[PDB]
Each structure stands twice: as structure tokens, then as C-alpha cells.
Ligand binder design. Structure first.
Ligand SMILES: [K+]
Ligand SMILES: [Mg+2]
Ligand SMILES: [Mg+2]
Ligand SMILES: [Mg+2]
Ligand SMILES: [Mg+2]
Lengths: 56, 51, 129, 51, 61, 413, 69
RNA sequence: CCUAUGCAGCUUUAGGGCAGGUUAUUAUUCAAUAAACUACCUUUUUUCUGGGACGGACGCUCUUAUUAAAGAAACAAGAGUGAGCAAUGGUUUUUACUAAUUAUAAAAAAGAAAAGCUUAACUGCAAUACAAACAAUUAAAGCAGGGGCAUUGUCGGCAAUAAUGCAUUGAAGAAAUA
């Protein structure tokens, strides 16, 4: 994700997802997927150090 | 064999004592590329002898 | 700073007009990490130098803001979008950055709106809890 | 210094040899060292240093 | 190490030099046992030398 | 493509933080930033004239607190240090005594401040302890400089803090608030014109109550560092609060713990403050401060030398190493000392009974070199006392004293 | 060199003794790591441009060229 | 009309560039690169000459007139040349031979041809002269080393007089440093 130039982001899952993964799992998903569906719907948060400690 | 700082101490020791500064320290050894150019490492206060 | 001005004065007459047009858009966009890049051309057979400007690719996107519960249209460069995604989104970008770094009227107005709304909701929630 | 267009001075080759670094040293002749001792400006009964 | 290798190569070459010189001289000598021009009694010795020496050298080359 | 081309891309680096220098603010936050980071009075005046109606309580407070920094001292009253750069507690210059502001800045500051004071009164009831402390500190600075003579709102600021047994401080007090309140009040009672009798009584009464109830009884001194504690000690000394010594011991303890962070300009202040208060039993505290001059000798100025010597004589603390440092530094800075200042310094050595060869030798050489000497009665006896007390003998001091007597007799007012 | 040409060079101040200049970095004990520069090859091409070249190699000064615009 | 350290405008399949548009390729949700087409920017386009243009010419040898020392010019005249040879180079022996070259009264202890052996068509230096504005160009006794043919002489290319190109930049073999 470091060299993805913003195309890939680390995602922390708050609720079980059909394909991305389960709650508490840190995964890598396409930037567009998080921007449009997962983030506004409220099912996941960005994998920042604060979010990982609080949720992951 | 003297370095830049060592040569200054040899020539003008008073320039350091008047300011209460320790004298420069001598070198440990010279680069091997200069083998056959020097016989000994100079001491900042030279040791004088009789002739 | 002195070197930046010296380079700018060496730009081609048409490139100077393009540079001014780019700068005048600062108050209308979310400047973010946008930076100015100069193209310099050199040749082997002569001692000639040509200075020209490198354009910025602007992107129109809609980012989600949970505090405002809205998708805010924004004009961004790719670098700015990458930084916002990394830091934690639009809300974290506006709440983790001082007004001095924004360097934009559009950004400053948006940040001021978010800060005031966050305090109101937080104060009410804090009193409740 | 212009010669009319012939430019005869730049018709010669170029040499790039680097001279020895020892051209930066101060040269002292043995005959000059003795003269100072004979006149009495140097003490020959003890070690003589660059100082 | 490089100087040692270079000295070794030159020493080996000089050891083989006497044989190379012998072949050089021999290859340019006329073998009268393979000459039929004398049987023809038509050409001079110089013409015989060119005809057979050239053939031998070209074949060796 | 006969003529090959090489392409280089040059990025124009810019400062990370914007300086609000030319653009006009258009928001609540932008206006606050422009006022805070203003560089000149003309900029602050322009902002007030244009955006007068778009002001709040915070905007008025910020403008007042920054005004003292926009008033600059004369270039003739400042001396530049060699290679010193701005840092934490260190400036690139030292000030001569009683420095004066620039000639053309006083009318601007006075005019700007008058407008601000006119529109402020409605906002007096919406201030917090932090805002009150900053306002008190700013006015004290504005009085030390020749901008104001008194604080119109002093009665209101003190009442706000005093109400409900310092209830506001009990919840919103920090180490900075106590340092600014005490320091500001001291500069409002001593700097410039001495004081008014009613003003002096109110300020001294408030300081005594604040120190005992908050810093001592409630143990708020735990919020103070070495610098803040030192500032409080200076304020108490100027106010001559010698009755209470319990707080002085507490403040001295804080200074002792954080001695390393203090610079020579701060150590000298502690010496003078203790000397004024007469607290001379803390020999251990004096020893720790003396050890701080060993390494920072390059940050000492003539004011620090004079204060240290006089404070030591008054306190009766004689440290040979510290006195040696002051004497050697003073010998080179003789050109900077004034005639009155250099007489006090000489008298200080005499009282301590220390004879410094280099210091007195330099003074004697200078006096003899002067063809016509004119010593004033005000310090004629001081210089004579120093030579007698210091034990300087016939070598050359009798000649210097002889010239001193002749000059004094030449006038005999 | 021919006498006529040599006198002009001396009259202008030519006093070189060696083909190139010595390198102080080569003296033992006087090596400065900060002032390190890899040895470069001397350029043998004279500057013959009549606009910004050597005044001794051109008969008269020529006007400068126009800048791109 | 001719001559300039000339100037300007215009034209094009004279040189270079990409900085607008179109087009091609690639990439992100108004971009980057360019041997293309259009537009634009910048630069170059000798001299001699019975005035200039048109035509012709520009290096290096031989010969003719200006007598029998040398030298000597014209868009004067009559001819060559921008090489060849592994022997047509070096050196010994023999003799019913004494030619040829672009041109030419060279040469008999000399050459040519025939027969034999060879690589001096070398390494490192060189007194003294011819010529000559300078650069370069020409002849050369002699010294050391390793060789060839002779057996104590000659060989540092070719009967002689033409067969050529500074410095810079680039490349190859070897050696010394760092
Ligand atoms: K005519
Ligand atoms: Mg002409
Ligand atoms: Mg010559
Ligand atoms: Mg022989
Ligand atoms: Mg010959």
C-alpha cells in the first residue's frame, strides 16, 4: 500500500463484510471501494494508529 | 611526520600556553601509501638531546 | 525563496501567464499538498535553457464527512487525496490541522464549519454522558 | 594579442601531467644550514628542529 | 597478482617461440618433390616459387 | 532528433505555515490568525479599521496582548551579541539600563490602544483566568514602555479573580497564570512613575492573599517550573513582600530542582530578588546557582555582572570562583560600564573584601591614561571606599586616589 | 616560442612554471575530507565564440543573440 | 552601381527547438512524453574577379619567357598527381644486356635482369647545415642495443624532383598511480 500511490488503503472493519473480512480484521482494499461504499455506510474506518488501538 | 594541527603546536607553543590551552596531540600513524617517506612520528614538544 | 523568484523570472512569457492563472485558483480549491513544478530543458549541442511550467491535474471527488453527514464536493490533486486518505479522512484532516497550514479560503471556511459543529455535538454529548 | 585570424598559438598540443606535491615544501640547502651554525645563529650542540 | 600472471604469460610465449620460427621458415621453402613444372620444363624458378608457395600459405591460412 | 534533450523537474519549496501578510481575512479564524501574527503596527491598525465590526472578545484580547511586542526599543539602546540567535530564553542582544522606545512608534501605539480601550468595556464579563492574566501582563509591559500610565480595568481584573475565594483559578489555573499575574502587577507598581497610594495598597493586598491561599495552602506551586518560580520571586522582591517566608522557601526549592534550565540573566535575577527580600540562610541554593555560571560565561552581560556582585555583597555570600569570573569579564567590558555603574561594582568588591588583580589593574591603567579626570561627589566616596576596602596599596592606587581627591576638591559644590 | 610572441605573453603577466597546478590535498597530513573533489580532465577547447569568448582570439566584439520568447 | 562586424520585412521540402491546437501512446478520477501536420520562436546563407552577376578557380610536383648565381608576378602558357610494390625493400655472386618513367643529356665499380639467403619498410638519441614571418617542411656524420647479407663493407624503405591535413574531440594496445 506504501507504493500504491493512493490506490490501496489499509481498512479496519467494524462489522462483518461479505467478502472484505470479519470484524476486527485489518485488510487491504481498493481506495474506490472504501471511498464510496464501506466508509459512508459506516462499516469500517481507516487504519490509523488510534483507530487500530481503539477497534482492532 | 606532522599533521596540520601538530605543526602549529611545534612552531608556536606560546600561542597555546598564553591562552591556557593544552597543546595539540601527536598523530598515531601515517597512511601506508607514504611508507618510505617518514621515519618517526613527530612529538609536539620535541625531545632535545646532546650532540 | 530568493531562488524561487529567480527561477520564476526566467519562465517563458507564455508560461508566466499560465503560472498566474494557476495561482489565482488557490482560494477556489482545496490546495492541500499541491506544489509548483518547473520544467527545464537542456541540450547537448548548445548552451541554451528553456523554462516552462508543469500543469496540475485536478480531480473532482465527493468525500464523506460523518460530522456533517454529507458528501462534500472537492477539487483535489492526487497527492492531496492520498494524504487525506492516509491521515484518516476529511474529518481528521480538518481537525488535525491548524488554520495556518490550509492556505485556502475554501479550505478555511470548510474547516471552520466542521470545528464549530464538532464542538456543539461534543458539548451536548458530554453533558449527556 | 590578436594575430589576424591565423590563430597560431592554439595549434600546439596540451599536456596534463600533475607535478609532485613536494613543490609545496620550503627548500633548505645543507650549505646554508652550516653557514648559520658557523655565524652562531644556530646551536649545533643540541638537536635542531624546524622551530 | 596481475604482474605475476603477466610475467607467466610472456615466459610461456618465449618458450614456444623457437618452434614458431621454425614453422615460419619451413612453410616458405620449396619442396621439389611435389613440383611437376620442372617436368614441363616451361617456367622459371621464380614462377615455380610463386605458384606453390602461395598455394601452401593460402591453404594453411 | 539530432540535438538530444535532457529534462529536469524543479519543485519550488514553500513555507509550511502561512504568514498572514497581504491577504485580507474572510472568516472568524482567519482574522484571529492575522492579528496574532501581525508584524507591524500599521498592519494591526489596518485590520482594526477595516474589520472593526467583525470583532469578538477573543479578538480584542489577542490584539492587546500582542501590542507590547510590536513596540520596539531604540537601536541606540541595544547591543548585539556576537553570533547569538533567537532561542528559548536567549536573545541576540542585551538592553542598556532604562531603554527608550522608538521615537515614531509611541504616537501610533497610544492611538491604537485608545481605540481598543473604548470598545472593550462591554466584554469585561466574558473573560477567563487565562485572558485576565494575559491582559494584566500586557498592561504591565505597556507601562514599563512609555505607552500608558495606569490600567483602567485593574479594579475589575483583580475583582474577577478574587470573587468566590479564587473559584475561577481553582478550576482554570495553570503555571503560566500565576507567573504572569505577579509579574504584571509588579511592573504596574514600580516601572516608570512610582505609583498611586491607593493602587499600591490594592496590589500588595491582592498579591499577599493570592500567594498564601493558592500557591501555599492549596499547593498550586506544583504547577510551577524553574522559570515561572523565578519570575514570581522577582515580583515579590519588587513588591517587598518580606513578611511571608514559607512561600519563598517553596519557590527556592523549585528553582533548585530546575537550576540547569536557568540562564545567567535568570540566575542574576534570583540573586537580586533574594537580596532584596533579605533571605540569606539558603546557602545551598546560592551554591547551586553559582555552579551555573561555569559553562554559560558567554551569555553574561554587564547588567548580570553588576547584579551578581551587588547581590553577593548584600547577601554576604562570598564564592571565590564566582567572583573571579565576574572580575575577569568586567575587566574586558570596562568600556560598556558607566561611571556610576563601575563605582558600584568596585564598592561591591570592597565590601566582600576580595582583591582582584586584573580588575583593579585595568581600572588604574584607564584612570591614569585619562589626562583630565572629573569624578563626581555621588560616587567619589564609593571608588575611594573600594580601594581602601580591597586593600590596594601604594603600587599605583594611591596615585589614582590622589587624582580622585584632586578632582573632587576641584569642584567642592 | 618566437621572441615576438613570447614578449607579449610576458608583458601580459604569464609566469606559469608547470603544465598543471599542484594539489594541496596530496601533501601527507593535510587531507581535508570536507574539501574532496574527484580529479577532472582538463579541457583543451578554446572559447572561440566572438560574442562571449576570449577577446584575444577574435578581431572585434559581436552583438549578442536574442532570447527565446 | 559597388563595398559593410550591416538593419529590417517576406518566402521555403536551408539547420535546431516545442511553447498553442489536432493526432498517437500511456496513467489518475483541467495530466505526462513526441523524428508527424498546422501555428510560433531562434539561427545560417565564403572569398578572388581589369565594377558586380553568369562562368571558372582555390592542395602539391615538372617544364616555357624575364639569359649563362639564386629569387621573381598576371583569370599568362605546356603537361602530371590525391598512388603503387611483401617485392618493385636489404644484401652477396655471375654477364654476348645498358633501358624506362607525366616529363628530363642522372648514373660503368654504376644500373637492369637471372640465382641464393633475408625483414634495417628497426628500439633510444644526435653534432652541424639547407630553407624559412611563424607554424611546420628538407639533408645528415656519429653513439648504444637487437638483427640481415657479406667477412669487415653496407642496410634507419623505393634513381631523384608530386601521392597530402594543425589543434580539439573520439577510439585501441600497454604501463604507473589513486
Ligand atoms: K575596366
Ligand atoms: Mg567579392
Ligand atoms: Mg622555424
Ligand atoms: Mg655489420
Ligand atoms: Mg636506402
Amino acid at each position: 500500500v506504501e507504493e500504491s500511490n493512493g490506490k490501496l488503503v489499509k481498512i479496519v472493519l467494524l462489522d462483518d463484510v461479505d467478502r472484505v473480512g470479519q470484524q476486527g480484521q485489518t485488510v487491504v482494499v481498493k481506495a474506490g471501494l472504501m471511498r464510496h461504499l464501506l466508509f459512508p455506510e459506516g462499516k469500517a474506518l481507516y487504519a490509523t494508529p488510534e483507530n487500530e488501538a481503539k477497534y482492532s | 611526520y606532522y599533521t596540520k594541527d601538530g605543526l602549529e603546536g611545534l612552531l608556536f607553543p606560546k600561542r597555546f600556553t598564553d591562552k591556557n590551552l593544552p597543546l595539540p596531540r601527536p598523530a598515531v600513524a601515517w597512511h601506508p601509501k607514504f611508507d618510505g617517506k617518514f621515519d618517526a612520528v613527530g612529538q609536539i614538544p620535541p625531545v632535545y638531546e646532546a650532540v | 525563496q530568493q531562488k524561487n523568484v529567480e527561477i520564476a523570472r526566467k519562465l517563458l512569457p507564455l508560461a508566466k501567464k499560465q503560472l498566474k492563472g494557476l495561482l489565482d485558483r488557490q482560494d477556489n480549491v482545496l490546495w492541500g499538498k499541491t506544489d509548483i513544478v518547473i520544467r527545464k530543458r537542456t541540450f547537448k549541442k548548445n548552451d541554451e535553457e528553456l523554462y516552462s511550467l508543469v500543469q496540475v491535474q485536478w480531480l473532482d471527488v465527493k468525500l464523506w464527512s460523518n460530522i456533517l453527514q454529507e458528501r462534500v464536493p472537492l477539487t483535489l490533486s492526487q497527492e492531496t487525496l492520498t494524504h487525506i486518505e492516509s491521515i484518516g479522512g476529511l474529518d481528521d484532516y480538518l481537525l488535525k490541522t491548524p488554520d495556518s497550514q490550509m492556505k485556502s479560503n475554501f479550505s478555511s471556511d470548510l474547516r471552520w464549519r466542521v470545528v464549530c459543529e464538532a464542538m456543539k455535538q461534543g458539548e451536548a454529548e458530554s453533558k449527556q454522558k | 594579442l590578436y594575430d589576424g585570424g591565423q590563430l597560431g598559438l592554439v595549434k600546439f598540443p596540451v599536456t596534463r601531467q600533475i607535478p609532485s606535491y613536494e613543490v609545496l615544501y620550503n627548500q633548505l640547502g645543507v650549505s646554508k644550514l652550516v653557514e648559520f651554525i658557523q655565524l652562531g645563529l644556530l646551536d649545533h650542540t643540541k638537536t635542531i628542529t624546524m622551530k | 597478482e596481475k604482474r605475476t600472471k603477466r610475467a607467466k604469460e610472456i615466459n610461456d610465449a618465449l618458450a614456444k617461440m623457437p618452434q614458431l620460427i621454425a614453422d615460419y621458415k619451413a612453410a616458405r621453402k620449396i619442396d621439389w618433390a611435389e613440383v611437376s613444372i620442372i617436368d614441363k620444363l616451361t617456367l622459371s624458378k621464380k614462377q615455380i616459387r610463386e605458384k606453390y608457395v602461395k598455394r601452401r600459405l593460402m591453404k594453411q591460412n | 532528433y539530432r540535438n538530444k534533450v535532457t529534462i529536469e523537474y524543479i519543485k519550488l519549496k514553500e513555507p509550511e505555515n502561512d504568514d498572514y501578510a497581504t491577504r485580507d481575512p474572510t472568516n472568524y479564524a482567519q482574522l484571529l490568525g492575522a492579528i496574532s501574527i501581525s508584524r507591524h503596527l500599521d498592519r494591526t491598525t489596518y485590520l482594526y479599521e477595516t474589520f472593526k465590526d467583525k470583532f469578538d472578545t477573543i479578538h480584542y484580547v489577542t490584539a492587546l496582548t500582542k501590542l507590547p511586542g510590536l513596540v520596539h526599543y531604540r537601536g541606540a539602546d541595544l547591543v548585539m551579541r556576537d553570533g547569538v540567535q533567537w532561542s528559548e530564553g536567549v536573545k541576540p542582544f542585551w538592553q542598556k539600563p532604562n531603554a527608550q522606545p522608538r521615537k515614531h512608534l509611541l504616537p501610533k501605539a497610544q492611538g491604537l490602544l485608545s481605540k481598543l480601550e473604548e470598545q472593550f468595556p462591554p466584554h469585561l464579563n466574558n473573560l477567563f483566568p487565562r485572558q485576565t492574566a494575559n491582559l494584566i501582563w500586557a498592561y504591565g509591559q505597556l507601562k514599563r514602555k512609555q505607552v500608558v500610565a495606569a490600567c483602567p480595568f485593574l479594579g475589575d481584573f483583580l475583582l474577577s479573580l478574587r470573587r468566590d475565594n479564587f473559584l475561577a483559578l481553582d478550576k482554570h489555573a495553570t503555571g503560566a497564570d500565576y507567573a504572569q499575574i505577579v509579574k504584571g502587577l509588579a511592573n504596574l507598581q514600580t516601572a516608570g512613575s512610582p505609583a498611586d497610594e491607593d493602587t499600591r495598597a490594592l496590589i500588595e493586598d491582592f498579591v499577599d492573599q493570592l500567594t498564601q491561599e493558592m500557591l501555599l495552602r492549596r499547593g498550586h506551586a506544583r504547577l510551577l517550573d524553574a522559570r515561572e518560580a523565578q519570575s514570581i520571586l522577582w515580583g515579590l522582591g519588587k513588591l517587598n513582600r518580606r513578611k511571608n517566608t514559607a512561600i519563598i522557601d517553596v519557590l527556592c526549592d523549585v528553582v533548585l530542582a530546575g537550576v540547569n534550565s536557568l540562564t545567567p540573566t535568570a540566575l542574576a535575577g534570583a540573586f537580586s530578588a533574594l537580596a532584596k527580600l533579605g533571605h540569606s540562610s539558603r546557602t545551598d541554593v546560592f551554591e547551586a546557582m553559582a555552579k551555573g555560571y561555569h559553562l554559560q560565561t558567554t551569555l553574561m552581560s554587564p547588567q548580570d555582572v553588576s547584579l551578581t556582585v551587588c547581590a553577593c555583597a548584600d547577601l554576604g555570600f562570598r564564592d571565590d570562583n564566582l567572583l573571579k569570573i565576574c572580575g575577569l569579564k568586567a575587566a574586558d567590558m570596562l568600556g560598556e560600564f558607566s561611571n556610576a555603574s563601575l563605582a558600584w561594582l568596585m564598592a561591591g568588591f570592597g565590601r566582600l573584601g576580595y582583591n582582584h588583580e586584573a580588575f583593579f589593574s585595568a581600572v588604574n591603567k584607564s584612570v591614569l591614561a585619562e589626562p583630565v579626570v572629573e569624578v563626581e561627589p555621588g560616587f567619589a566616596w564609593r571608588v575611594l571606599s573600594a580601594y581602601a576596602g580591597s586593600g590596594r596599596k601604594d603600587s599605583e592606587s594611591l596615585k589614582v586616589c590622589g587624582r580622585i581627591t584632586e578632582a573632587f576638591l576641584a569642584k567642592l559644590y | 616560442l618566437h621572441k615576438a610572441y613570447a614578449k607579449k605573453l610576458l608583458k601580459l603577466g604569464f609566469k606559469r612554471r608547470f603544465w598543471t597546478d599542484p594539489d594541496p590535498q596530496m601533501v601527507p597530513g593535510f587531507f581535508d575530507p570536507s574539501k574532496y573533489k574527484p580529479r577532472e580532465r582538463l579541457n583543451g577547447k578554446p572559447n572561440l565564440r566572438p560574442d562571449i569568448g576570449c577577446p584575444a582570439l577574435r578581431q572585434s566584439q559581436r552583438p549578442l543573440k536574442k532570447l527565446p520568447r
